[PDB]
Structure 1
Amino acid sequence: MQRSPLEKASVVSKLFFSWTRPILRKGYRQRLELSDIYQIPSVDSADNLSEKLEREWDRELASKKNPKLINALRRCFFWRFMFYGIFLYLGEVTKAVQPLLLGRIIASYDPDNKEERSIAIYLGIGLCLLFIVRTLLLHPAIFGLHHIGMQMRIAMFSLIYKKTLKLSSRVLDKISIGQLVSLLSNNLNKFDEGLALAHFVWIAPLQVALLMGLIWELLQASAFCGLGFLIVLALFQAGLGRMMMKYRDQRAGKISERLVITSEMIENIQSVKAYCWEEAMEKMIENLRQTELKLTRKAAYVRYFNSSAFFFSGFFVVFLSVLPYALIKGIILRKIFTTISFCIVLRMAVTRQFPWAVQTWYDSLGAINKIQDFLQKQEYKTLEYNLTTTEVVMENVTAFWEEGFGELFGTPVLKDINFKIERGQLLAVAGSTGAGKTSLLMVIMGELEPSEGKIKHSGRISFCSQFSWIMPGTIKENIIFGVSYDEYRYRSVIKACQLEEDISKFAEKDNIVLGEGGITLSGGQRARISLARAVYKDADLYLLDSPFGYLDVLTEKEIFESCVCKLMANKTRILVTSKMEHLKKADKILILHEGSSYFYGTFSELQNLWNTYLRYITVHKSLIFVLIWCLVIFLAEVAASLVVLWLLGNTPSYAVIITSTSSYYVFYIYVGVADTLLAMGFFRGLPLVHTLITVSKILHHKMLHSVLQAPMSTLNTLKAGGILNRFSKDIAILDDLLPLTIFDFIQLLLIVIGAIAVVAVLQPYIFVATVPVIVAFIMLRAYFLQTSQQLKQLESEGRSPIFTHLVTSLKGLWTLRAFGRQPYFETLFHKALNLHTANWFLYLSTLRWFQMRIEMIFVIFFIAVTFISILTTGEGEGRVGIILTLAMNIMSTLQWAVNSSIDVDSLMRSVSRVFKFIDMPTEGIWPSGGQMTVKDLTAKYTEGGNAILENISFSISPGQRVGLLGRTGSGKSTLLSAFLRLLNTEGEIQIDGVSWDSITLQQWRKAFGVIPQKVFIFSGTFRKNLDPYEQWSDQEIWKVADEVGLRSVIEQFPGKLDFVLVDGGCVLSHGHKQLMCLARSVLSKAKILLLDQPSAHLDPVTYQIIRRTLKQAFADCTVILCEHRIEAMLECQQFLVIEENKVRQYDSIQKLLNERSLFRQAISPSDRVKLFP
């Protein structure tokens, strides 16, 4: 990155934002290359702000009894806040004395006003000076206030993450990914810009006090008639704001709930596709959206009135304030016009700048209070010893997973556990499923605090878990995991873990960029990477929680005999295992039985025992009808105003005194009141908001439908953070910020067009005067948008790394805290923060450049017309000055319409991003016997890549068992997915004579019942997790839970089959999820069954359930079983072996095993006697 141009600049350059020119002149011609983003200023780096706010917050916590976050931000930003507020106020007081000069200038066009024609040439100079000094005080102050919100947000987002890395394990079940994502997302671009409105809590009352004193000179005691109406309207607006904030509190939790459901299934898209579960997931998402949209509609109906208050307040204020004075005393047109000029500023101060400031304070303090409440949660306790002889000792330990039951003393997870091991000894833990072997490791690690007992060790540990975690990056980064790279140790760890066979088959071959999750790999490869990472680290104690689950017999034997028994034989290690062979060469054995130690000792003792607006409008056919309605009313209003004006000049005492040389005020008065005459009442503003909110519902439905049916090659290129970004932030934009911004843009545009047309009909010169300013405005807008759109696209793309890092850091909390790598991930998070900050700051600077340039154009044009008007006014009736000055009263509203157009264009980027996902590509009795025939099948994952499987041909027969097998990483899962055409494939398969291309895909996928390798469990009840379609009553559901063995597990929770599972089934063990998958497969009665390693981690006792199910529930079913364990191959009639990317088939298993001496040598004696009796 090249340096920031704001580091070396000039004062005269910092005042006008000239340093932003070099990029603006370039992004206009070509695209914006990478080499053109500047490095952030050193003051805007996450480290400095993070440490500064952290020091202040820690001092606040330590000293005071009642700590508060606002007291800590006050000691960092208050003096700059108050420094910029004063210049903002000085800029705002200019707008109120402007009439005191412009009115005298305008009144000199009447030859019967001789007093003010003397001093015109000095009023003009004063007006030019006032316009010059407003534009220099307003915009730099606003930019300085914008630059402080970014710093505050960056400083608080670091504290949130640093606290997240310390939460207790008993609090993680109350905070989801959705809550943190919502917290970050709703404050990511609005908290920055909210500081430019906070000072109007005290700026606006002063303006009211000044303006009422100025008006009091015109209408002596009648001004309070107009003031009281504004006070009542402000009471009404306060009530509207209070009632608006109620509908948003009821809606946040529903969005939080929807986000986790949306994120769960997209990261499990393959299981959803295999189950054919799209129609149920979409229905759940729709039911969630149904109520949230109702709350959003109710909030928008109130925000409409809040925004509409400003336009309808003009006529009433002016008429009400002028009527009594005019009734007790006649009035001149000059007084009326001056009153309009003052009331225009008064209404802006009262109805648009105060309530927005109040709502800004409400929202900001609401965010800060939630941030503080998060920072005051319960922390993980690390208080333990840090040095000893590393003699692991544990005594009298009992722990409860439920906090209440452990506080009262709910059944104990552990009961009276005690053991001791020396330096270098190996303890083997064994037991049934659900016995509590992983929870013992959690007790040792400190994740589960025991109620009674002690654990004593040093504090240096290495960890390997039952579910493997893969962080984004390459393999080498996943293994070295934040430390120095030692070549020899890396080589020996790679060789010991049997990874060189699979690594040599990769293309980049060591630097494969893995995604967040590792779905580019297989099960055993991820398991071996997770084991190698633990082996690499140096520590006194090594905990290994069933690493051999997904490995075959030969690979497991090699790893155990050359990585645990020869590489780290001089280190203390605790291994959770099941095989009777591993217990032979352990030093101490612990066996658990539902909580209690059934046996502790040795083995010698056990044997003794742009087409985007156009596409957006045409999404819904009712929007066009509403727009045509809004146009037909507007044209009638214009035609009525035209005839009421035309009937004044053609007709001839009364209260209002009007003459011939001062009748030109009739237009000046009209232009100031047309805001009320062309405003949108509730017959036009409520239908518009309603029909614009319906478009978001339609677009969300289309987006979700189109994502769920894309091919897997398209879906793998996506990331978790990008999906989460697009489904949270852009959708919230489309539901909240688009309707009312569009409404304001349309309102202002109609006002400008009506004001121009009505007058240009009666005087065909004011249009001619206005043209050259309109052309300049349009040219500058078109010049700026070319770069603005690119910068906005980059900023919108820059929010994905933050969410990706948040997700990956929440999924791997235990490994991070066990290894001690928190500073590493804090450094990783700071980089993503800086990367977003650069683009956001650049866009924010160029916007202010545009704003000040448009202001300068307006000011120079007005200065040009002022002197011409003053000079050309001869000895009476300054006709030249009557036209240009009125043109400049319509250009002032066009200036506001331009900025409204700018922010509408900035909000359409979300619409374009949403439309990009809708345009993804699309992947698109009979089952009597189940006979299958495969011919010339060839499978490959990516187009133009190596073929995992090449020219496979075999046949099966109805009602026959087939055993599929091979080495780890051979293509068993690839074959079982090529049956369902989940990837790119050629050749054919026919089932009972019916081929692929004869039928549709969704019908071909209903001939199969599948058990996958990765268990998918979403948030919901047990019953819903068993059937989302709700096809079976509780009779059959309980009858099947009786058979798969889930009665005692399900009855353990308070709502029997009504209990709600959170965090993806964290309440269950590893075997209970396998049993739920088996139940799912049993419930749907199919003919052809594809079982991908069903009994992964099950002990020998619980595999009996699987084999009884395969014996009784599947009788007339063609089964294909991909099993790594040797005993399951005793029921199969055919065998398929995958090797060298091709399949060889066998009838008997003896023929299979006699030809593989090494593989045949790896079989345990218990499983050896049965194969060869």
Structure 2
Amino acid sequence: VKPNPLQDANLCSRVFFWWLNPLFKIGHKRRLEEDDMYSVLPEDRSQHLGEELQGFWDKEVLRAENDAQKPSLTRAIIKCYWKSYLVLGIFTLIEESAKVIQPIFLGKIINYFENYDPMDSVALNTAYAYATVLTFCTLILAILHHLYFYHVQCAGMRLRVAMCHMIYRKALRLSNMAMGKTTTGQIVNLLSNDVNKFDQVTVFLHFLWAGPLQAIAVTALLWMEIGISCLAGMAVLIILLPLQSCFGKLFSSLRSKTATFTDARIRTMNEVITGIRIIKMYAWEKSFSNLITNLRKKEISKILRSSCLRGMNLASFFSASKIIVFVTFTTYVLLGSVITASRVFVAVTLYGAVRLTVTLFFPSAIERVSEAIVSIRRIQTFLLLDEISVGFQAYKNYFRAGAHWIVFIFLILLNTAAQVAYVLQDWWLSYWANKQSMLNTEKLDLNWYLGIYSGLTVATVLFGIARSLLVFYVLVNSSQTLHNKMFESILKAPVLFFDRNPIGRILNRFSKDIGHLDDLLPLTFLDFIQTLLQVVGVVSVAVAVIPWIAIPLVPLGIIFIFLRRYFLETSRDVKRLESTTRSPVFSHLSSSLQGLWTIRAYKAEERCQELFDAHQDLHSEAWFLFLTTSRWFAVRLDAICAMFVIIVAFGSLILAKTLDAGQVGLALSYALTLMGMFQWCVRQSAEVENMMISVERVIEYTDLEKEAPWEYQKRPPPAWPHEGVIIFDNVNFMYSPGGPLVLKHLTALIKSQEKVGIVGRTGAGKSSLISALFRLSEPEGKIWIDKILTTEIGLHDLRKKMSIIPQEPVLFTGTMRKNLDPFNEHTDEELWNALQEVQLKETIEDLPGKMDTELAESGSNFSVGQRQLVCLARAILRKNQILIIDEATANTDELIQKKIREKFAHCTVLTIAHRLNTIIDSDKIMVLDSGRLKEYDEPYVLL
């Protein structure tokens, strides 16, 4: 078999995941697909994880049968996993306690500088001991975390597999009555949505008791440093939840209304794409163009609001750590106390450690727990049933379509001001402390030191709001101006492009790509640039204090790109394997659920169970590698993330003779915040690169084949169609520009006021005659019509003066006046008379409006004969001479036949039909053989 290297692995070697190096060396050049992966542990099989849980559930229900109660499911899970829960509780408690000693010892390190005696060597050893003790908390938080995390992630796949196994085992013991109420889709949804929520609960499970405990532990430390003023720092930290709740409940309605706005546009686009030939033959593009541009305008107007709202939310979240500090220190100074460089940075670090933790971990845990509880409830109620008896060009083309270069210069200038204010606000406090420590009465005026502080506080908020608003506007305008180009380019493609591509593809494109361009790109781009700027500023303020940190950063900067490449060259394969191993189990379940009686007939039912287990083992095996390949990177990242802090701390301590307390405190208070921002910045790039494919495939359009322009410079006479004699020459027709031919030298002569019939074998090139007269594809040879040709005339000047009766009618979703008159050029009485003389008036009088009747599902209220009659009404209302009647039916018809035989004023009627009983007493007839056409003068000669 395939023995995994996880077993037989000593300690101090699986903390760095050293047993995964060879696998990468295989995935560097060979692109391993499926046969070079490791199997699962012997204690991770489906049967071993399902049998014990089934036994525990049976024991629990047998115990609950005694009392007059209902058996529960969460008790059976607790009684099985309480050991693992209690084992992980110790480590999560240790990790939560290890985040409090760091500020307490940073305070002592700074206090050593506050009382500095050069003629001493005893306090330096104690300072070195403080630094050594501070060095261990970082190592515990950065190294020993990526193993507990892997274990707490692996502790959920077992529960998921057990639930799936027991659900499938129960599903094969249902009766006919119990099977009649449930459906296959219901079971598929219950297995693909309810169970899959058991992988993100164990991660956010320890944030219900360790959340408030850390807050209470931090709230009591500040009383021993600054006093009552610390409460001022906690009053602002509460308003964030009511601030975000209203934002969410206001954004939901905007999302709903913009969705209900774009749904109609999607439907109209689907209607337009299907049936492009009739629309192109009738020259009815402007109506749909306007109907689409109006809905697009409304959709953009509704999206701008939510965009601005989310931008304001991000701007408010970016600068919440400044108001708290400003308020608490203003209150602390206004009482009468004096500022010190050892009590400010400790409070800053504690605030930064509590606010992000609470506001990012507590709100999500409640939602996760509620979802898990409702899923467990659903699965419990189910189991109680009866039984039986890209490139840089892709970015340039997307950015240069939003504004000029001066706007980009202004945005670059505005990006580097909020961060400068963010850093200067902190530097001002260190300057204050240094100026205070130089005293030897002679107090300091508060006006200057408070006014400058308030100004530096306000500037940050202003420059944080303006940048976000500008970025969101610029990035929405690009999609707004790109959709129009896409639609205008696709509204002029030939039929050749339309017949070689399905409708579902283009519809899914127009929906999903525009959704992605309007929903997820600006948020991700703003988050990425903000998180990158924060890290750049942190590194800059760390280097500006010690000019020697710039030397080791280059070796710590070259390896990062190489590691990123070496990981991404092989990390883009596990998701594909996960998908192609998750699909077959669903396929097997769907195929085996319907074929139930064939399994109960034969005395073999456990074979399907073994097959299901063997199918799920492959998915478990393909999923096992995902967690390890994900955790193999965080260790190498946190290594540098902690080495930087160690280096800066020991370098600041070694050079204790040429600096002071304020600047060393400022330098050390920033190094303890690099981890989360580093992780977010290195993570968002993957999503950006994955989402750029939408832009890639959108720019794929707008550069396609283009037919002849709609109009030329030369204009036809005001009344061109008159005595519509039509001649031909040696003409050759073809569908592809370099493909085979379908006609061979069609030359005839059709005079005026003649009924020319065409009789030929189907599929031998009979319907290819109408596509040559309407020049849907440029043919070969001259086609003279009314003393002029058909090539030097525009398409709209040609297709307008002719009429064609399609083989099958089509009705567009709209009113009654639109389907008969999209361009308002005729009166209402004229249309009423034309509809009366076609013998159809009673079908519309019974309707309420009789003139503005809305039709559902392309006119589902009318019959086929009414469709032929309304097409005839359209043809009569057009009132042209050249009329092409093509019809092939198998079926009301006698009246339309006699009408088209009498109503039309004998204007060059030609027919393309196969029914010989319709070509009777025609002026001229033509016969089609497999390649050519033969014209007969009189039909009496043939008969």
Same fold (TM > 0.5): yes
Structure 2 residue aligned with 1:541: none
Please give the per-residue CA displacement for 1:39-92, whole angstroms capped at 9, x wherever unaligned: 999x999xxx9xxxxxxxxxxxxxxxxxxxxx9999999999999999799769
Cα separation, 1, equivalents of 2:139 and 2:752: 95
Structure 2 residue aligned with 1:1035: 829
**Residue 315 (structure 2) pairs with residue 308 (structure 1):** yes
Structure 1 residue aligned with 2:845: 1051
Cα separation, 2, equivalents of 1:99 and 1:992: 95
Structure 2 residue aligned with 1:941: 735
- Aligned pair partner of 2:259 in 252, 262, 271: 252
Please give the per-residue CA displacement for 1:805-862, whole angstroms capped at 9, x wherever unaligned: xxxxxxxxxxxxxxxxxxxxxxxxxxxxxxxx99999999998677534422222224
Structure 1 residue aligned with 2:520: 737
Cα separation, 2, equivalents of 1:229 and 1:777: 39
**Residue 644 (structure 2) pairs with residue 859 (structure 1):** no
Number of residue pairs aligned between Structure 1 and Structure 2: 811
Structure 2 residue aligned with 1:905: 689
Cα separation, 1, equivalents of 2:930 and 2:881: 31
Higher helix share: 2
**Residue 260 (structure 2) pairs with residue 274 (structure 1):** no
**Residue 624 (structure 2) pairs with residue 620 (structure 1):** no
- Aligned pair partner of 2:411 in 623, 630, 633: 630
Deviation at 1:1045, TM superposition (A): 3.5
Partner SS for 1:1126: coil
Structure 1 783/909 Cα, relative in aligned 2: closer, same or farther at 3 Å? farther
Structure 1 132/1006 Cα, relative in aligned 2: closer, same or farther at 3 Å? same
Is the Cα contact below 8 Å between 1:962 and 1:1120 reproduced in 2? yes
Is the Cα contact below 8 Å between 2:493 and 2:705 reproduced in 1? yes
Structure 1 687/143 Cα, relative in aligned 2: closer, same or farther at 3 Å? farther
Q: Out of 353-362 and 1127-1136, give the one that drifted further.
A: 353-362
TM-score when normalising by structure 1? 0.58
Structure 1 residue aligned with 2:504: 721
Q: What is the letter of the counterpart of residue 481 of structure 2?
A: I
CA RMSD of aligned residues (A): 5.7
Deviation at 1:616, TM superposition (A): 0.6
- Aligned pair partner of 2:936 in 1146, 1150, 1172: 1146
Structure 2 residue aligned with 1:402: none
Which residues of structure 2 form unaligned runs of 5+? 51-70, 116-122, 168-184, 383-391, 441-452, 584-615, 709-716
Among all aligned residue pairs of Structure 1 and Structure 2, give the percentage whose two residues are the same amino acid: 28
Deviation at 1:140, TM superposition (A): 6.4
Deviation at 1:615, TM superposition (A): 0.7
Structure 1 216/1089 Cα, relative in aligned 2: closer, same or farther at 3 Å? farther
Structure 2 residue aligned with 1:136: 147
How is 1:28-177 mapped onto 2 (pairs within 5 angstroms)? 94=95, 97-101=98-102, 104=105, 107-108=108-109, 110=112, 112=115, 117-118=128-129, 120-138=131-149, 141=152
Structure 1 residue aligned with 2:480: 697
Cα separation, 2, equivalents of 1:627 and 1:77: 57
Cα separation, 2, equivalents of 1:18 and 1:1020: 67
Structure 1 19/217 Cα, relative in aligned 2: closer, same or farther at 3 Å? closer
Structure 2 residue aligned with 1:60: none
**Residue 249 (structure 2) pairs with residue 242 (structure 1):** yes
Is the Cα contact below 8 Å between 1:1013 and 1:1092 reproduced in 2? yes
Is the Cα contact below 8 Å between 1:1135 and 1:1147 reproduced in 2? yes
How is 1:533-612 mapped onto 2 (pairs within 5 angstroms)? 610-612=392-394
Is the Cα contact below 8 Å between 2:745 and 2:932 reproduced in 1? yes
**Residue 347 (structure 2) pairs with residue 339 (structure 1):** yes
Please give the per-residue CA displacement for 1:1091-1130, whole angstroms capped at 9, x wherever unaligned: 221x7355xx433224424532x42633332223334313
Deviation at 1:288, TM superposition (A): 2.2
Is the Cα contact below 8 Å between 1:310 and 1:348 reproduced in 2? no
Partner SS for 1:994: coil
Cα separation, 2, equivalents of 1:771 and 1:1104: 90
Structure 1 residue aligned with 2:855: 1061
Q: Out of 304-313 and 348-357, give the one that drifted further.
A: 348-357
Q: What is the letter of the counterpart of residue 144 of structure 2?
A: V
Partner SS for 2:732: strand
Is the Cα contact below 8 Å between 1:770 and 1:891 reproduced in 2? no
Structure 1 619/359 Cα, relative in aligned 2: closer, same or farther at 3 Å? farther
Structure 2 residue aligned with 1:214: 218
Structure 2 residue aligned with 1:777: 560
Partner SS for 1:1090: strand
Please give the per-residue CA displacement for 1:568-604, whole angstroms capped at 9, x wherever unaligned: xxxxxxxxxxxxxxxxxxxxxxxxxxxxxxxxxxxxx
Is the Cα contact below 8 Å between 1:752 and 1:893 reproduced in 2? yes
Higher strand share: 1
Q: What is the letter of the counterpart of residue 100 of structure 1?
A: I
Structure 1 235/266 Cα, relative in aligned 2: closer, same or farther at 3 Å? same
Structure 1 1029/331 Cα, relative in aligned 2: closer, same or farther at 3 Å? same
Q: What is the letter of the counterpart of residue 297 of structure 1?
A: L
Structure 1 1085/289 Cα, relative in aligned 2: closer, same or farther at 3 Å? same
Q: What is the letter of the counterpart of residue 903 of structure 1?
A: E
Which residues of structure 1 form unaligned runs of 5+? 50-70, 157-179, 376-609, 660-669, 801-836, 1155-1173
Deviation at 1:910, TM superposition (A): 0.9
Please give the per-residue CA displacement for 1:870-926, whole angstroms capped at 9, x wherever unaligned: 777878829999979966755753432221222222221111111112233223323
Is the Cα contact below 8 Å between 2:308 and 2:472 reproduced in 1? yes
Deviation at 1:363, TM superposition (A): 11
Please give the per-residue CA displacement for 1:310-344, whole angstroms capped at 9, x wherever unaligned: 21210112233344445454453333222222322
Partner SS for 1:1063: coil
Cα separation, 2, equivalents of 1:890 and 1:1137: 85
Structure 1 740/643 Cα, relative in aligned 2: closer, same or farther at 3 Å? closer
Q: Out of 911-920 and 111-120, give the one that drifted further.
A: 111-120
Structure 1 874/1059 Cα, relative in aligned 2: closer, same or farther at 3 Å? closer
Structure 1 residue aligned with 2:895: 1104
TM-score when normalising by structure 2? 0.71
Is the Cα contact below 8 Å between 1:211 and 1:342 reproduced in 2? no
Please give the per-residue CA displacement for 1:9-48, whole angstroms capped at 9, x wherever unaligned: 7468999999999997688769x7999999999x999xxx
Deviation at 1:297, TM superposition (A): 1.8
Please give the per-residue CA displacement for 1:977-1001, whole angstroms capped at 9, x wherever unaligned: 2323334743342322433432343
Cα separation, 2, equivalents of 1:1064 and 1:247: 30
Structure 2 residue aligned with 1:535: none
**Residue 489 (structure 2) pairs with residue 706 (structure 1):** yes
Cα separation, 2, equivalents of 1:1133 and 1:81: 92
Q: What is the letter of the counterpart of residue 861 of structure 2?
A: V
Cα separation, 1, equivalents of 2:260 and 2:205: 31
**Residue 703 (structure 2) pairs with residue 919 (structure 1):** yes
Please give the per-residue CA displacement for 1:255-300, whole angstroms capped at 9, x wherever unaligned: 3322222222212122222222222222212222232222222222
Cα separation, 2, equivalents of 1:863 and 1:300: 37
**Residue 814 (structure 2) pairs with residue 1023 (structure 1):** no
Please give the per-residue CA displacement for 1:982-1026, whole angstroms capped at 9, x wherever unaligned: 347433423224334323434333343222234332322233333
Is the Cα contact below 8 Å between 1:38 and 1:838 reproduced in 2? no
Cα separation, 2, equivalents of 1:96 and 1:332: 27
Cα separation, 1, equivalents of 2:248 and 2:289: 35
Is the Cα contact below 8 Å between 1:706 and 1:920 reproduced in 2? yes
Deviation at 1:702, TM superposition (A): 2.0
Q: What is the letter of the counterpart of residue 230 of structure 1?
A: L
